[PDB]
Amino acid sequence: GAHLARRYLGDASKEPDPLRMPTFPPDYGFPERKEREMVATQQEMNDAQLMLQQRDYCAHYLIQLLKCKRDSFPNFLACKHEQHDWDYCEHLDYVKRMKEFERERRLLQRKKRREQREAEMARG
Amino acid sequence: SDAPPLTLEAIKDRVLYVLKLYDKIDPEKLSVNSHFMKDLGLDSLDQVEIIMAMEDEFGFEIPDIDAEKLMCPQEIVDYIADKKDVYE
Amino acid sequence: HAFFKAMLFMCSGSIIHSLNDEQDIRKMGGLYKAMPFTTTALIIGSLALTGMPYLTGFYSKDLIIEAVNMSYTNAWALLMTLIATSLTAAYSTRIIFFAFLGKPRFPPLV
Amino acid sequence: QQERDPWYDWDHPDLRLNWGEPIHWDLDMYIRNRVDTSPTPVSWNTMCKHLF
Amino acid sequence: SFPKYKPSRLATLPATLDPAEYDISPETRKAQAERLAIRSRLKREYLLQYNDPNRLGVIEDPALIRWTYARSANIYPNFRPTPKTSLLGALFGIGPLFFWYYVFKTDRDKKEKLIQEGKLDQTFNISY
Amino acid sequence: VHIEPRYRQFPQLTRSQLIQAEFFSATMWFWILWRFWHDSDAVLGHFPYPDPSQWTDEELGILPDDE
Amino acid sequence: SKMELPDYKQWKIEGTPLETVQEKLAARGLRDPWGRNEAWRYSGGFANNVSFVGALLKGFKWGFAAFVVAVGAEYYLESQ
Amino acid sequence: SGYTPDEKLRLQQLRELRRRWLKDQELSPREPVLPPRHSIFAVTHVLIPVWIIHYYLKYHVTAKPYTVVERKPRIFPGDTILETGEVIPLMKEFPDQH
Amino acid sequence: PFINRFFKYLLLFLITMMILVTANNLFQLFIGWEGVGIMSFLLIGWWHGRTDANT
Amino acid sequence: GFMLALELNNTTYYLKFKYPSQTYKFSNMLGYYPSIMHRLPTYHNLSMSQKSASS
Amino acid sequence: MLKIIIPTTMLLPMTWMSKHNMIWINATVHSLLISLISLSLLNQLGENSLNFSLTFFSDSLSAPLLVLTTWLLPLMLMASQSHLSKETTTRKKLYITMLILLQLFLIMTFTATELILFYILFEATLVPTLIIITRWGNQTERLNAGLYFLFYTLAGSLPLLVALVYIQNTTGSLNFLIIHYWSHPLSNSWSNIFMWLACIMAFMVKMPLYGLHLWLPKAHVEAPIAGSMVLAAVLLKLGGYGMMRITTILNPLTNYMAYPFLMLSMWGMIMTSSICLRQTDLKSLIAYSSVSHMALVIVAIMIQTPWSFMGATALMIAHGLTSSMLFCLANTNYERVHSRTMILARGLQTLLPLMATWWLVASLTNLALPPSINLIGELFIITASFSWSNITIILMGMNMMITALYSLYMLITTQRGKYTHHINNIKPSFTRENALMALHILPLLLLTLNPKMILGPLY
Amino acid sequence: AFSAPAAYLTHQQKVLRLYKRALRHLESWCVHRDKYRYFACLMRARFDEHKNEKDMVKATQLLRQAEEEFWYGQHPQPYIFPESPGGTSYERYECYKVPEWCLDDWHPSEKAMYPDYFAKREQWKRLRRESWEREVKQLQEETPPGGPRTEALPPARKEGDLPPLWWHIVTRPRERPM
Ligand SMILES: CCCCCCCCCCCCCCCCC[C@@H](O)O[C@H](CO[C@H](O)CCCCCCCCCCCCCCC)COP(=O)(O)OCC[N+](C)(C)C
Ligand SMILES: CCCCCCCC/C=C\CCCCCCCC(=O)O[C@H](COC(=O)CCCCCCC/C=C/CCCCCCCC)COP(=O)(O)OCCN
Ligand SMILES: CCCCCCCCCCCC(=O)SCCNC(=O)CCNC(=O)[C@H](O)C(C)(C)COP(=O)(O)O
DSSP: OHHHHHHHTSOGGGSOOSSSOOOSOTTSSOSOOOOOOOSSOHHHHHHHTOOTTTOSTTHHHHHHHHHHHHHTOSOTTSOHHHHHHHHHHHHHHHHHHHHHHHHHHHHHHHHHHHHHHHHHHHOO | OOOOOOOHHHHHHHHHHHHHTOTTSOTTTOOTTOOTTTTTOOOHHHHHHHHHHHHHHHTOOOOHHHHTTOOSHHHHHHHHHHHTTOOO | OHHHHHHHHHHHHHHHHHTTTOOOGGGOOOOTTTSHHHHHHHHHHHHHHTTOTTSTTHHHHHHHHHHHHTSSOOHHHHHHHHHHHHHHHHHHHHHHHHHHSSSOOSOSOO | OTTSOTTSOOSBTTTTBOTTSOOOTTGGGSSSSSOOOOOOSSOTTTHHHHHO | OOOOOOOOSSSOOOGGGOGGGTSOOHHHHHHHHHHHHHHHHHHHHHHHHHTOTTOOSOOOOHHHHHHHHHHHTSTGGGOOOOHHHHHHHHHHHHHHHHHHHHHHHHHHHHHHHHHHTTOSOOTTOOOO | OOOOOOSSSOOOOOHHHHHHHHHHHHHHHHHHHHHHHHOTHHHHOSSOOOOGGGOOHHHHTOOOSOO | OOOOOOOGGGOOOTTSHHHHHHHHHHTTTOOOTTHHHHTHHHHSTTSOOOOHHHHHTTTHHHHHHHHHHHHHHHHHHTTO | OOOOHHHHHHHHHHHHHHHHHHHTTSOOTTOSOOOOOOSHHHIIIIIHHHHHHHHHHHHTGGGSTTSSOOOOOOOOTTOBOTTTOOBOOOOOOOOOOO | OOHHHHHHHHHHHHHHHHHHHHOOSHHHHHHHHHHHHHHHHHHHTSSTTOHHHHO | OHHHHHHHHHGGGSSOOOOOOHHHHHHHTGGGHHHHHTTHHHHHHHHHIIIIIIO | OHHHHHHHHHHHHHHHTSOTTTHHHHHHHHHHHHHHHHGGGGOOOSSSOBOOSSSBOBOTTHHHHHHHHHHHHHHHHHHHTTTTTTSOHHHHHHHHHHHHHHHHHHHHHHHBSBHHHHHHHHHHTHHHHHHHHHHHOSSTHHHHHHHHHHHHHHHHHHHHHHHHHHHHHHHSOOBHHHHHHTOOOOOSSHHHHHHHHHHHHHHHHHTTOTTSOTHHHHHHHHSOHHHHHHIIIIIHHHHHHHHHHHGGGSTTTHHHHTHHHHHHHHHHHHHHHHHHHSOSBHHHHHHHHHHHHHHHHHHHHHHTOHHHHHHHHHHHHHHHHHHHHHHHHHHHHHHHHSOOBTTTSOOHHHHOHHHHHHHHHHHHHHTTOTTSHHHHHHHHHHHHHHHHOTTHHHHHHHHHHHHHHHHHHHHHHHHSSOOOSSOOOOOOOOHHHHHHHHHHHHHHHHTTTSGGGGSOTTO | OOSOOOSSOOHHHHHHHHHHHHHHHHHHHOOSHHHHHHHHHHHHHHHHTTTTOOOHHHHHHHHHHHHHHHHHHOOSSOOOOTTSTTSTTTTTTGGGOOOGGGGGGSOHHHHHSOHHHHHHHHHHHHHHHHHHHHHHHHHHHHSOTTOOSSSOOOOOOSSSOOOSSOHHHHTOOOSSOO
């Protein structure tokens, strides 16, 4: 995407590093951040044997989808609402990750502006 | 099954069929015994083209050393019959 | 891929057997009407191979391309994968066009 | 052995050898199940450059 | 006019591109005649035994006998100790031995002194 | 079904092979149309892709450059 | 059984690309003496063939008709 | 150009001989003189093999520990365990973002 | 003329590939590996009078 | 892939003849990989097998 | 142990008092019965060996070798009676006597408790083999072959004898049990280095180690079929067995005295496999394949691990069976066409289909196809070598490739293609030849079901 | 394959073989029939342009650049007939070709089947046995003292003779033996 063009062809110092982020404190620009909550307990995911990569903040919808698939086994066309709910929750998680990326790049650009412009007003 | 076993009459008919579609040959005075050079007045390039047409007709190619000396339709029929194990 | 690749090979085998064990596409002419069931099967197999939606190859290939597009991956590898995806349709087109379209190019004893 | 005439009536058609003719020192290397030295449409040293 | 084809060891010069087949002298024609005569005499000698109804067994080929003998038993009597043969023998016979000795000895010295230091991660290594 | 060669003529066809070929081509096309009518998102995606530029600074937590 | 070859007087290059080849050769002073040997590939049941997109859409009409019937059944069934 | 008379005559003689030889490869009407239940397939190729294998697994293989190991079944909230009668409670009252 | 041997060879390849797929240790999987390799060798050179097939 | 291949295949009907490109030669002869790797390493290995190891 | 030795000795007057047309039948039947009796030695203990008496003992290493020897005698008799038909009655009985004496010496060699008795029988095996090669070999080279077979062995074994008596002067005994229980380390000295060399080089020559192997192609090519069978199947293993017994007194010297032999074995294994690719003689190819397999066995014994010892035992047994079968297969075609050139008789699958199947199975076991015991031994040795140093795989894997490349090569050269036109005396396979091939191949396959029976003491 | 080769190829033969190879490779390049016919007529015209050249040095050099042009412009993957030396069915049926002498080694039980075939086989063997010496005598008579010069063989010339060295040509296995 255009982010790769900005990081590789433009100034990389103004662009987020996907491997190393976030670098700014999570409570830096926010006055009050509510910690992300989880519905499914560790035991419930362990008993469902989901996968270590499926045990994210969307695991409860996946658990209901799996239970619905098992219960109506012959009718493999019955777990549509559960599949939709799990997909929607994953989509919201991805949107949150995009928001984190955009927040961190905006913070880093604002940091560069403030630091070098207070230097600019500090050099004369 | 596969193709029917080949016969001498079929080989001769197909050779004459191909020769009669050649523009440099009169269809009515063409015989199985007609020499390409003496009777039909062709040259070596026409003989090469006739050999190639026969190869296309029967789906197999004749080596140059053998092809050089097929100078009449009967010779071509005999060569094909001997190559493909046709006795009747 | 097992399904449609095996089907494509058997379609090729039927063509070869019909044309007296000929395997060169340059001597295969218009088989679209002469071998209708074989033509249908090879068309459907080539559509499955190229990822036509809601066919067997779609549910597999479609997802693989999306996953490569949406991963922290080598950029050259991703570009090469996309180019290979185009070349797949290219050689499927080559097979169909040369083996089934146009005029016959096989020996006259049909 | 792949370079020999395949339309000649060899005494050993698969080996493309004639009875009594002198045998190359490296026949078992050139039996045409093996190393081939036949001319190619594109020159050697030009295939090498393109491949490398 | 067109790019020229140059031959190599593993991609030889085609006959049609060979100038020797286009510059023909009477001695060349007579040499070709002699070659054909030799081939024909050998062919008749072979075919008189091949078609013999009373012949049963193997038609012994002196060329095959000569080839196998030259490849096996004629080699040592024709060997002469030469700087070229001496260096080739020394290299191809002894150099790989010291090369592999050095490689394996270096690897095992590293592994052994690394075992001594107690840093090799030998856990679950009970079969050897 | 005994079929003979024809020598420079179009081969003899049976009705069964024609009807089966047509039936299976039509089956493939109907399946594609039916699935696209019911499962279009699988081609077109179901969720909208957000535009990061339409996100305000307050909801992403960026101060107005003076702190 | 025992087929006989069709009469050779029918194979003509007229109306086929072989005629175009013949006229473009005559524009150069040349002639093609093998066109009638090739005419059968264009004459009869091989006179017309489909295009690539037409070959891809081999059974689209019947399948589309069946799909329309099925969606109409869906429309007229769900109102009970 | 063409055959020499000797070549053509030799080819004709060889052709005659070869055609008679090929004619003699044919068989007379008596040449091979030879000297002097519906579901039976599914009972001998399926039912019998599965009898032996089931007997072998049930009474010999499973007579030793850890020879046949299955991964435990998945347990979901709300399930009832057959073995003990235990009931797993449901899953924490979703926010219900409908 | 050897269609029965051909079907036997196909069945042998299928058995070796099933062994490969269902193997739980590396030795059994290697057995299936080499079995499918050998069956491939035998079926590629089916027409063993042809030099190209053996090559 | 479909459109470009179809266009290039339809241009084969034109009464025009041109000698092939070098890219075409690379593609058709399989990157020259079997022309080099099936001749050079095999020749050198067999040559050393006779000249050095045996003799 | 006398229940094996005395019937073998009784084989001699039985063949010398038999009717002129009954020698082969009697010898074959009674050698088979002796093999059946010897099959009872396979019941081994674990902790320690079966110590029958002060003179003879049986181990899990000795018993498979003894069974292989007793089984190889009837196969040699079956393979010998075809080309010895024109021979007189007395010379046929003398040939059978040579075979019986060889078996007797080998049986006593594999079970001797004391190292001097083992050495004496180990040398005694030389005389019948020499007589067989130089009296019933076909070509003029056999005489030279005999000389090469003799002085290579003695030039190695004469120092060993000296070392042996020297040891008994300082240790006080040469009984193997006493030697093993009272074993002491060898210090790092020149005297110890030369005593190590004297203890090892005879078995090295017998293996043969690469560089000391020139006698083997000559002797195996020029020998008659029974001579080649016993030379490859059993006699070579006399080296391996010997090493496995004598390395118990060579620690910790072997820790560094083994480097040149390991380098020679690995590189020469590559070298002999490569030599097999360019060989015009069919028997020479089999001989060089034996050299390569024995090089792998040398590596296994030199690295001194339980996995390597197990692999070496399995590979010794498997190679004995496979090499004997390959020699018999080549001899069938030799008796057909009276030439050992590999390219003379081609396309034999068309003319001899069942013999082609035998060829295929022998070639498969030669390249160690799983789950054959050939690959069991090879894989155990390769795993032990990898533990010794991870770079060894590079050579080992290379060897594997070359092995397959020549094995199938042989198979493709003699069985496939088109038949030679002028060779018209290729008769159908006899029941004797097919039975000989089967009696080679079936025990080899059955050993897969019970591999431990050949895995040795370290199992 | 059936004709004995000569010591060398004439200029006329070389020119004809070049014509055939060029036309075949052109057909490989020009897949379609009408286009191939057009360009083959152009090739034939370009080839006839020098049909009546008298200076053989000029004709030889023309042949040289024709060969050079062919080698530069040849098809890398020309069409090969399936049973031609480079074809996909070249030696496919060789494994089914069994020499006739093998029939002599059949068990008498095997020959009990097919009695008439083996009666005719005995007749053929008698013919070969009775003709061999006359064939050898004819070959000795007709061969110049300096040995044969080519591989051509003479026909039979008397009333009841057979062409010398005929058995293995006449008793070929088959092209489709099974
Ligand atoms: C064709 C194949 C035939 C079979 C080949 C058999 C291979 C046998 C080779 C024996 C391997 C090693 C032998 C002895 C071990 C070390 C040898 C020496 O080179 O090492 C140095 C020895 O120092 C010097 O180098 C002295 C040796 C040099 C004099 C010997 C002549 C070597 C030239 C090569 C001759 C070729 C031999 C084979 C002939 C066929 C180590 O120095 P140092 O740790 O302080 O002394 C150790 C000995 N101590 C402990 C008793 C004191
Ligand atoms: C197929 C060819 C094989 C050739 C094999 C030749 C090598 C055999 C090994 C050496 C043979 C003789 C060794 C003697 C037996 C060792 C017993 C012993 O321990 O005696 C040593 C004595 O060792 C010696 O004297 C041996 C020295 C060498 C004498 C003969 C030299 C011959 C050439 C030497 C190098 C060749 C040996 C290795 C060749 C490898 C194979 C090619 C110590 O005894 P003491 O005198 O009491 O001393 C105690 C205080 N230190
Ligand atoms: C498509 C891929 C490659 C294509 C490239 C090929 C390039 C070739 C271009 C044109 C070739 C020439 O100019 S070819 C130049 C050759 N010159 C001569 O032949 C002059 C003397 N003429 C004769 O010898 C006879 O007339 C003869 C012609 C043999 C007929 O003889 P018949 O009447 O007795 O058959």
